[PDB]
Amino acid sequence: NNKRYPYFSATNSVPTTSLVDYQVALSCSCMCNSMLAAVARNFNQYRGSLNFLFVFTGAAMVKGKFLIAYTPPGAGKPTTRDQAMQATYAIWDLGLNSSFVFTAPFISPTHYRQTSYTSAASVDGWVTVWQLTPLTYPSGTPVNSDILTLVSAGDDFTLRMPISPTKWVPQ
């Protein structure tokens, strides 16, 4: 019904397609409202790592594994875990520790990248999240777990050339 959540859901299954997919691109919309993007839109170019933070809020009794990946351009965006697995990736295992910090590496032809979708090369690759193994659990446990999804600038990261965004009006 197209309304937003601070997270995404997973369950006792391995969805043939990806669970969520963020497009590494400050201009990009799922970030529309993050501090990162809010600051970035006031600057013309960027450089460095983006850090994607995931927090598992399902029940303690729940387990499972995810496959988070970053795919650079050139061969088109991945359509299967198998393909994604060929690019930059990391496996996220549920357990005692609740969260996971995933870094989308800054891999690029140019020392800098434009912060905005001003005309059209549209993107700098994608971040895709997949189930490696199903969320598994016992009877008496909520079958659908929610994973909080946050984003932020990584350590390497910088912005430059202060500018004005296309003016807007909150809804």
């Binding site: 529309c32 790592s49 870094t103 990261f157």
Partner: protein, 256 residues
């Protein structure tokens, strides 16, 4: 890689952590509070209600005033159940408002940039003001300034055929003649307060707590009054700016 958001924070990584890679960082300064806000931006404009030879009087016209409030925040003739009281000096408003039916222009004056992007709770600085002529006629104009909280002294001409606004010990400016068209200057952080609210002041402005909630008193840089034959665009500039206690920025509309 692996961590725990619960504790209020997390490892702030770069590629080299989880992978056979490395830090690609380059030196860079342009992202600094001070440098960034240290550029000029329009907040409104001034339109003279009267000659350079007469007694000044508050005057509105198609949302234009012969006087303006020096603050980034939204301002206008004081609002009333029955409509904004236009026979008076502008004051700080608690929201932005369309001049009319369509969104623009705005009835209110303010630093739209600063509003759409003020990632902080409190700020302070000195204010550099620029007043630029919108017209092409040989100019004859007088400008009066005053610090937050000072008497408007919007009284009668003492000396006939001369500008009442010029009749003060306060800092005033006199501009006249072909080619002489812009006024520029800088004023000090002049508020009784230690720091200013970037957006909201979660309290009442009166001891009786009945009035103007959300607006801190004397939370501005004073004001401008104009008189003479020329209208002007008014811009402000944050000098040696400082900010405190980070907070959320203005919401941005999610794509349909």
């Amino acid at each position: 890689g692996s961590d725990n958001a619960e504790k209020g924070k997390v490892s702030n990584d770069d590629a080299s952590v989880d992978f056979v890679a490395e830090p690609v960082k380059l030196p860079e300064n342009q992202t600094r509070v001070a440098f960034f806000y240290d550029r000029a931006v329009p907040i409104g404009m001034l339109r003279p209600g009267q000659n350079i030879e007469s007694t000044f009087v508050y005057q509105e016209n198609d949302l234009r005033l012969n006087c303006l409030l020096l603050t980034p925040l939204p301002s206008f003739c004081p609002d009333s159940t029955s409509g904004p009281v236009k026979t008076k000096a502008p004051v700080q408003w608690r929201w932005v408002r369309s001049g009319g039916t369509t969104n623009f222009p705005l009835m209110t004056k303010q630093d739209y940039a600063f509003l759409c992007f003020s990632p902080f709770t409190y700020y302070k600085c000195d204010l550099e003001v620029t007043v630029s002529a919108l017209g092409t006629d040989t100019v004859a104009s007088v400008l009066r300034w005053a610090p937050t909280g000072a008497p408007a002294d919007v009284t009668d001409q003492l000396i006939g055929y001369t500008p009442s606004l010029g009749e003060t010990r306060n800092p005033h400016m006199w501009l006249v003649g072909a080619g002489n068209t812009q006024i520029s200057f800088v004023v000090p952080y002049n508020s009784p307060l230690s720091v200013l609210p970037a957006a909201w002041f979660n309290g009442w402005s009166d001891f009786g707590n009945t009035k103007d909630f959300g607006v801190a008193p004397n939370a501005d840089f004073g004001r401008l009054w104009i008189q003479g034959n020329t209208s002007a665009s008014v811009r402000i500039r944050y000098k040696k700016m400082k900010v405190f206690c980070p907070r959320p920025t203005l919401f941005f509309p999610w794509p349909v």
